[PDB]
């Protein structure tokens, strides 16, 4: 359906222990394709998807160039945020920045975004219209002004509506076998006897792509959300995902319960039943 490109930047100070940690990751949909890590050897932007490896020197030299410009801008930011907030040079603090663009099934621009965060909390963010900002508090107000006076949002809106999406569209072809795929969940159920008056019923979705999925239990057709244990959707490690939902059933009523799976890759919603 739709598709997205997103870059994630984690910048963490290490006072009396040197330069800041700076990590950059890049994703198209749920697939990472690149990484930068201040602490690694190459100081290059490295590929983490096999489709991107044959991009060329021009691409790699540029991404490295830019990823290092980010690194530096983030090295300054950490100090500037120490000041805004009147904080000690002793403290280790964290900055986070996420930006990316989305195309619809038309592979036509749909939306862009840019969020910045100091210490796990919203700082400033590009609003949906990509022409104005939302400073979260008093400190971010200074940035909001600074950035409006720099016409920062003009420059972002342009990247997001151009470079961003055109390259998102590029990658979707360069890795069409990976990215335009739809690995439907491999599903099955299990039954353990938590006691002799009870038994755990667990619904498994394995090896699916993308991550978006929905697992739900029912008793007599009626949802058990209140009484269901959902784990977070988790990485299998091979570019697919996993997830399970478990209910406890008083022995005898296994018949009453059903599990339900909704995914992109299923033509019809699966209705599992312990029957």
């Amino acid at each position: 359906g739709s598709h997205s490109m997103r870059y994630f930047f984690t910048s963490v100070s290490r006072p009396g222990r040197g330069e800041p940690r700076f990590i950059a990751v890049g994703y198209v949909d749920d697939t990472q394709f690149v990484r930068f890590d201040s602490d690694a050897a190459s100081q290059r932007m490295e590929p983490r998807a096999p489709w991107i490896e044959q991009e060329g020197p021009e691409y790699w030299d540029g991404e490295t160039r830019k990823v290092k410009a980010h690194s530096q801008t983030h090295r300054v930011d950490l100090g500037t945020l120490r000041g805004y907030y009147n904080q000690s040079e002793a403290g280790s603090h964290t900055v986070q920045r996420m930006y990316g663009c989305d195309v619809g099934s038309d592979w036509r621009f749909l939306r862009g975004y840019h969020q910045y965060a100091y210490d796990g909390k919203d700082y400033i963010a590009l609003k949906e219209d990509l022409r104005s900002w939302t400073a979260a508090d008093m400190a971010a107000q200074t940035t909001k002004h600074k950035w409006e006076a720099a016409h920062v949002a003009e420059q972002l809106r342009a990247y997001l509506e151009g470079t961003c999406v055109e390259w998102l569209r590029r990658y979707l072809e360069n890795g069409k076998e990976t990215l335009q795929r739809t690995d439907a969940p491999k599903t099955h159920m299990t039954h353990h006897a938590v006691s002799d008056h009870e038994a755990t019923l667990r619904c498994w979705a394995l090896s699916f792509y993308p991550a978006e999925i929905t697992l739900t239990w029912q008793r007599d057709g009626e949802d058990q959300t209140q009484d269901t244990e959902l784990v977070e959707t988790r990485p299998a490690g091979d570019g697919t995902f996993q997830k399970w939902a478990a209910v406890v059933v008083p022995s005898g009523q296994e018949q009453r319960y059903t599990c339900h799976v909704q995914h992109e890759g299923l033509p019809k919603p699966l209705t599992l039943r312990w029957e």
Partner: protein
């Protein structure tokens, strides 16, 4: 100065089949700040050739990481995960239940 406690899942990449080689996963997520210490254990001993994904984060800004290592299930060996974080009063250990 927010602070989130790490969520921990210990699981295998493929269904666990004794004698057949696999990858052991320890997925920690929802924590803040980013400093975290994750080990995988085999019978209560640290595994040395363990790797981890690149630091990324969710919609609420909390961080998540996958630690993984090639391994082969046997009837005997008990594998587990050990996680230390600031929000954790003491190193947390989560056993690996192949048959979950």
């Amino acid at each position: 100065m927010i602070q989130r406690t790490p969520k921990i899942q210990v699981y295998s990449r493929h269904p666990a089949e004794n004698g057949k080689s696999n990858f052991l996963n320890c997925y920690v997520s929802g924590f803040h700040p980013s400093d975290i210490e994750v080990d995988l254990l085999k019978n209560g001993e640290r595994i040395e050739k363990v790797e981890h994904s690149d630091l990324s984060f969710s919609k609420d800004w909390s961080f998540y990481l996958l630690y993984y290592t090639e391994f082969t299930p046997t009837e005997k060996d008990e594998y587990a995960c050990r996680v230390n974080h600031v929000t954790l009063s003491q190193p947390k250990i989560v056993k690996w239940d192949r048959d979950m």
